[PDB]
């Protein structure tokens, strides 16, 4: 159902590689990106499904 | 017997050493051979060029509906088209687009032939929601855009690009005479087929003087494109080719001064959206009448307004930068300091112009030559 | 890794400056060199990579003009202050020629920073502006290499300034207009300092943050080709685009290209 | 007469339009739809002076500017300063309200219709096209009698601060100065 | 020479034919028998070899000694191999002549510049139990059919099938690939079907923008006439041979390319992709690690809820092979 | 550009005409009735679709309608310079794939060539 469906979601999107990676993100920058050169090398080695 | 068959290569047998340290001295040539790895110019091509009337024929049939181009022909085309359009407008400043879409037997012009980047543009995004019907006709419009072309002068190279997408095309009279007529007429018509080659296109083509060429992917299309882009090269001199065009300075209004007046723009008046209601924009030299975009000719008085720098952009082609005598830092008995740069002069070779007899590095010769295109010693 | 470099050209035409001199007005050479310095030191002081030129163009040629204070501006201004005292003094008339060689100027500065921008490490983007200050009259013999220069500019996005003094030059309307660079006139010439450390010395990322003053209106009158003079209504060739003032049955140009 | 009522009724703006130029006497019905079918050595003194002036010179710190100098400057670039002129027609898209910006297009259409008309005139290099350009000038000044003058009457009424007359006087303007200067060009070829 | 149609070898200048069938161990054909007599009497030049790195087996090896040739040259795209037998490949036909730079290879553009990448998925708690619970060979289909690699196959199904780009899904393990493919309705090659089947699905693969995703289960491990192909999903391959994730990835270059390996955390399978990939790291290329994908939860995919995930087990731990 | 056979054509074993042929090559020269059938209606067949490649630079597309054509013992009659260029992959197709193999041939070979 709806709940089961919530339940799967939160076991699998976040099971080992989010419980830290998350807690960085909240304690991480938070501000603007240090420079230009940074966001477009980002983009470059990003994959296509990644910019979306 | 073949060239791989004989003494295999030794590329490392280059390097040699005469003082047990001195092949640094060499990999420091190969730097010197690093360079100069241009031709000194950033074309190489046509130097020179004429002004075109190009009108683009589309296809508006059922066929335009296969999905051999994602997400349909017509979108990739109308796509394509849209950085033809801008690509052809960057290197011709003075040419004219029609276009014109072929569907259900008939021919509608879509767009009247002028040289306005945004109408078409917008014209394009309009009809990339048309409905596509019947089959073309070929006839209907290579005679609208004979009969548009028959009054331009001479001079103009008067041509027409037609993207046929279905292989049958109904001529409600022959078409050869057509081609004839085209041909007394002196028209390039050019087309670019999608599906496979048919006699008719390629009878026009090879009659009228034009190319013929059919899209093996959206990759060739482009290539294809960017190759219609070029402009036909021009005789030295054909005729007495002028004509009057105007230079509308962009003079802004601001409410500090007391000639500010607010004006609606021309161009903006005849869309059916509100017109700009600006504080300036470009004043027509003759008729002192507002537009916001160049180049445009004016609906007034039938002047053209076109912007100074495009014209002028062009320039470097017809006095070429003549290329600098290259000489050994040795054999130079002067100043060792760069004329341009007033860098040291390090390098083995140092370069002197024939005129100011200056002194410059490679660095600044490649960039005189490839950017700047004009002696900084010769200006002054 | 943000190193910026900037240029200045400082108009040294010596009619314009003996003129305003004799005006005994409250704006001389003297202060103008003065506030060139200090916008110097100011743009060095707003980082340690930032680097600077200075460039002075006369009837002659262009010259590189490069106790409690910085060490290296102390040494900075000594240099330009011995070369302008150099190039004026030792200026002498020799001929009728009074147009300011601004072109030469400024092909000097785009060769400097092509010359700076290769030696800089890969690893950092060298943005490189140019900053004009206008006193004398505008040269239109001048036009086609102006516009060469300009476009040459623009090829290597670099940003050109014109603070125009006295008479508004249209060339360097259109080479801050092509360029995105800021061109203003000084309303008081003794407040040209304060103009230039309020609008001037922010670089292209600092002046999205400012408000600046809108761009005044540019014209874009073209030169014709056997006068020279700019002009409204042209005749302009369809081969090779060049513009004449009066009709012609055959076009000098084509005539010359064999 | 049915068939010339029908396409103003498919145009209501031709038929306003219509009714501008034929109704107010402006132009006949006939011509309507006939369209729609250096000094002295002083010279070298100042470059002595100059070059005297500068033999000896001094970089100055104070000098350079001061507190006053500075504030004005401020000021000047303060917004709503000369410089920085914030207004710039502020509201211009909610003054001049729409009823009079309908005229207002109704009159640029209409100046630029008779302009139109009036260049493609011109050049008269056959004497038929000279009374035609005569009769436009006649259709011109009775437009703008009968627009313009109320238009300017209106706008005074309610002190509206953009000059829309003003850019539309400037067209008229030039039209009458080029054809003024044409006419005694052609006074000239038979002198 | 392959006893297919029989062309007439006896009396030609270029003969072609495959292993295993000059090495043949057993009763012969009657005419195969005469044309291997008349071909063992003659002198051959230039012996060409193709994929000469499976050479040093017990059969293969004698073949080079069941003909007589002047020269042998032999060509392969992917010279590693396990059991160190490819040092005996230096005598058998001769020295490694030349070893082509990928790297600036693929710089010229000639060959098309694969964005590598393994991206792994966590184990689903319903698999995970079963995974450590049961250790004889039994593991494979666990982390095999893990659902959420399978929804990470779906995603990249479907997103490369909107940007439109041709997809090769390798997959050994064939028992799980039938319910992997027949799942999303997609065509597959088991292998054992015939050869005018996977003939005319290759042949229609390319040229046919309706359908553009294949399925492959071991069977394109070696040289064949695949069309061209930007992405390539590997899923549960073999062990450690980087001869054969070598050779898939070389189905693939002909960022123009780019090809996925989807493995599951906390298992053999993460130890294998460790020691698989180390002969392309070797030969320039780098494996980014993708540990989230972008848009996972945007759209609808399989096994979305825990009933079904549930329910998988049962069928996966139906082969009770005993 | 393209020469469409639907069907094998087989001549009438009507008049009479046939069979007294076809018995005579079977109790003199020995030939199958249905081997001589075949050779017959291949030969005709591969006459009639032959005649659409004329010159080195002429190019022309060939389709059979029929799925008795897929069969060896038809195939092996068509000549030698039709056999290399009929691949095992195309033998069975249906119209859609055919199409795009039409298709697919007729873009690449609309391209210029060199001598
Ligand atoms: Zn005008
Ligand atoms: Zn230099
Ligand atoms: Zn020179
Ligand atoms: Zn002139
Ligand atoms: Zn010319």
Redesign the interface.
Known sequence: ?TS??A???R???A????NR?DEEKQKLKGGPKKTKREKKAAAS?L?????? | TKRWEGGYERTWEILKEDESGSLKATIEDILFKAKRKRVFEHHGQVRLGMMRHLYVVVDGSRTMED??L?PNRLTCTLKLLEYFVEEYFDQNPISQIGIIVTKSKRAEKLTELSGNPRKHITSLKKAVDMTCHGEPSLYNSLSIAMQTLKHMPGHTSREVLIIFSSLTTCDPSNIYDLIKTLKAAKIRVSVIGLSAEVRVCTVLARETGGTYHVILDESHYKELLTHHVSPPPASSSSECSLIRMGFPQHTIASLSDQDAKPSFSMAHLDGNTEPGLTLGGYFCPQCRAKYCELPVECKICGLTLVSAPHLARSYHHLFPLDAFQEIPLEEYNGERFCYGCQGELKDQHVYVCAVCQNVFCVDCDVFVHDSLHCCPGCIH | DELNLLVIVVDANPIWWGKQALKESQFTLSKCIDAVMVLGNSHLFMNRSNKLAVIASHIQESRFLYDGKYELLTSANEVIVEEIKDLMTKSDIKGQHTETLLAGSLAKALCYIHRMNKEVKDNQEMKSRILVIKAAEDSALQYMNFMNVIFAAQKQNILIDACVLDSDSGLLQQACDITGGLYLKVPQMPSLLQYLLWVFLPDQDQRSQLILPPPVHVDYRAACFCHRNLIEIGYVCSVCLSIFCNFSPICTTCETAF | LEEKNRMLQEDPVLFQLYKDLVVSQVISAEEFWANRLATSQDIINSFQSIRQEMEAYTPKLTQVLSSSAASSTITALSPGGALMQGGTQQAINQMVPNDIQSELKHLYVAVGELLRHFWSCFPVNTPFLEEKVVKMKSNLERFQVTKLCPFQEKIRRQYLSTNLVSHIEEMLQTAYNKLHTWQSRRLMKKT | FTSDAKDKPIGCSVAISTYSMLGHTTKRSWEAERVMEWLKTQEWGLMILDEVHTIPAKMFRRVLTIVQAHCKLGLTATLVREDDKIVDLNFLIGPKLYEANWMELQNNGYIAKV?C?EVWC?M??EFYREYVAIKTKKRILLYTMNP?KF?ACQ??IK?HER??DKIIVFADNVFALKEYAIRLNKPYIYGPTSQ?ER??I???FK???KINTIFISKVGDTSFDLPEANVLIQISSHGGSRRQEAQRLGRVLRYNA?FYSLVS?DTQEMAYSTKRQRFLVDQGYSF?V????????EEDLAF????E?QQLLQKVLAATDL | RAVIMFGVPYVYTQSRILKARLEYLRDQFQIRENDFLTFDAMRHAAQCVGRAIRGKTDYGLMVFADKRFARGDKRGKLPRWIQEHLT??????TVD?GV??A??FLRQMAQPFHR
């Open positions: 159902g089961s469906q339940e799967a979601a076991i699998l999107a099971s080992w590689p989010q990676e080695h994959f296509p499904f990644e910019k979306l | 999905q051999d994602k | 964005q990448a966590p689903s708690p959420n929804r995603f990249l997103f940007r439109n005018g003939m005319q290759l042949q229609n040229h046919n923008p780019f955390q980014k993708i540990t989230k994908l972008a848009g996972m939860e979305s809820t825990k009933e995930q | 095992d992959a195309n033998l069975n197709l794939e795009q193999v298709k697919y």
